[PDB]
Design a protein around this ligand. Structure first.
Ligand SMILES: *[C@H](O)[C@H](C[C@@H]1CCNC1=O)NC(=O)[C@@H]1[C@@H]2[C@H](CN1C(=O)OC(c1ccccc1)c1ccccc1)C2(C)C
Ligand SMILES: *[C@H](O)[C@H](C[C@@H]1CCNC1=O)NC(=O)[C@@H]1[C@@H]2[C@H](CN1C(=O)OC(c1ccccc1)c1ccccc1)C2(C)C
Lengths: 306, 306
């Protein structure tokens, strides 16, 4: 028992992290086979970052402009190209630690693990959800760009995120590994704002089920509601509408606990209207929305990876 | 910016995790050089776990009773001995992935990273604090025993914890790597209870400083208090006394923010008396006490490891 925000083991990703230096900019890159992937604003100066034109900036670069440090070993760049907002530096050495991998793009509401890195050296690991507004509430300091986000499925690493920037509210923005930004953001130091957020309704119900499995039962009740009439309360607590597919994916959790999905919604309706009155749920005094149904099932059953 | 509960990269520990099977019991073990460390209750049956006598149980075991799986490779046991509550299985192969390491014992209030494992396969990683009562609020299912807790200092892994059991309240108990339990617990399936807990006062102040660095300032105030008179309020909110050494270790954080330690205590006194009135701090609606001063500094400056 116990519930606790849990990242994937980071080993397979740690073996891919390298340092990329161009001019004065130094950031992280991701070495898979004989390519190093990194955010394209490495070619920029600081006076270049206000309104760059990256594809003019890149024709002016040379292979030897790019200094690649894999730990205490230098890799020679033998080719460079730009795919959307990421750079692809073709190097003379294939990464011997290259895991089986895929490039996937995730959906807001889905989670992943972030391996925060500085100078090519992993610093720490933690879990993140992709918010409905395509930002992530991470922990990122200067020079963390090129840290990646990922999930693991047995032996295969699915990379979903590359860090690029922080927004004025303190949230973080980035792309997938094919270089396409999550959300309406550009890699220019200008006045971008996050867009309005909502609470991931299906995840909250997931976490409430995690709670019941771990013995937190005080918020339960005999009441029930219709899917329709819960969504009326959702709309006014800035929660997302719940769909019959969400009710489906909650099916396995409903079964284990014996609490129908619509009864838990009725329990949530009350939590929203009444608050929690000095009580906690899984050691939180807030309704938590960054655990997916698969996250709950994973941890309240305990899958593994190699 | 951002604050987020962050574990150490787990790679160096992942390369040490193995599966130990004896009879019907299967648990995790820790392979450093030519030894595998694992909780001694692996020699037990289920009818042996109610009141074992381990040192009679062990003279009845043979080297070949112990089945050691390093991934898909079997290690032969060539020796076995008991040190306190852990077993030491001498194997014929030194672990080629053995990091530079130490065995340390941590102090309640200190944190570490846990790599939860099942069947020798790492499942996930997360941060934990050693509570004042020598328990830890982890996430552990059957068969997670032998998962270790650790910190990393550049390249050296300091192992501090080995999981053994869960208590009836759902908290977790274990030993250091020399086999000595944290707190007044024994590796017998009987009626042990955790002992009364308190809130780690120095950590809360640390986290409040983390908040101010990240822009959460609403709880600040011009007021001040004496170290004496804050400790009077501490005693009645089940907080630990604060000492002049805690004020010292908070010195660097006090300096960065320009908020004297005693002014933050006065800000905490108010939080305890008034609550938070619908507000949050670093996305928590509770006063959080599982971040050390070093944790805050580490993350609000961003150190790394190799
Ligand atoms: C890459 O290492 C760095 C990571 C950022 C820096 C601090 N926290 C992070 O996550 N990325 C950047 O610096 C990107 C680069 C330059 C601007 N930028 C960025 O994040 O800017 C924000 C910012 C933006 C507008 C106005 C004010 C600040 C920022 C926030 C805090 C500290 C530094 C920068 C591009 C090419 C987008
Ligand atoms: C080792 O894999 C296992 C890990 C435990 C099991 C569930 N969560 C965990 O952290 N350790 C044990 O099973 C230890 C072994 C046997 C008893 N034990 C244990 O944790 O018992 C508790 C328990 C204790 C007293 C009364 C009721 C339950 C427990 C809790 C939940 C599920 C199973 C067991 C010793 C040798 C101490």
């Amino acid at each position: 028992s116990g519930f606790r925000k849990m990242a994937f083991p980071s080993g397979k990703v740690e073996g891919c992290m390298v340092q990329v230096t161009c001019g004065t900019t130094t950031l992280n890159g991701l070495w898979l086979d004989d390519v190093v992937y990194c955010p394209r604003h490495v070619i920029c100066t600081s006076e270049d970052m206000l309104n760059p034109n990256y594809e003019d900036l890149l024709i002016r670069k040379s292979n030897h402009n790019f200094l690649v440090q894999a730990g205490n070993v230098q890799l020679r760049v033998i080719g460079h190209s730009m795919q959307n907002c990421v750079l692809k530096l073709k190097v003379d050495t294939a990464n011997p630690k290259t895991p089986k991998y895929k490039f996937v793009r995730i959906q807001p509401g889905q989670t992943f693990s972030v391996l925060a890195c500085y100078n090519g050296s992993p610093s720490g690991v933690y879990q993140c959800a992709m918010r409905p507004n395509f930002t992530i509430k991470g922990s990122f300091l200067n020079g963390s760009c090129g840290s990646v986000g990922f999930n693991i499925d047995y032996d295969c690493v699915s990379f979903c995120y590359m860090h690029h920037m922080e927004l004025p509210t303190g949230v973080h923005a980035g792309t997938d590994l094919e270089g396409n930004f999550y959300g309406p953001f550009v890699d220019r130091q200008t006045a971008q704002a996050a867009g309005t957020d909502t609470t991931i309704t299906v995840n909250v119900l997931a976490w409430l089920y995690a709670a019941v499995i771990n013995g937190d039962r005080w918020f339960l009740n005999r009441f029930t509601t219709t899917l329709n009439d819960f969504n009326l309360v959702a709309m006014k607590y800035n929660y997302e509408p719940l769909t019959q597919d969400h009710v489906d994916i909650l099916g396995p959790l409903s079964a284990q606990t014996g609490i129908a999905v619509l009864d838990m919604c009725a329990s949530l309706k009350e939590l929203l209207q009444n608050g929690m009155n000095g009580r906690t749920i899984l050691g939180s005094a807030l309704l938590e929305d960054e655990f997916t149904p698969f996250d709950v099932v994973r941890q309240c059953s305990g899958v593994t990876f190699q």
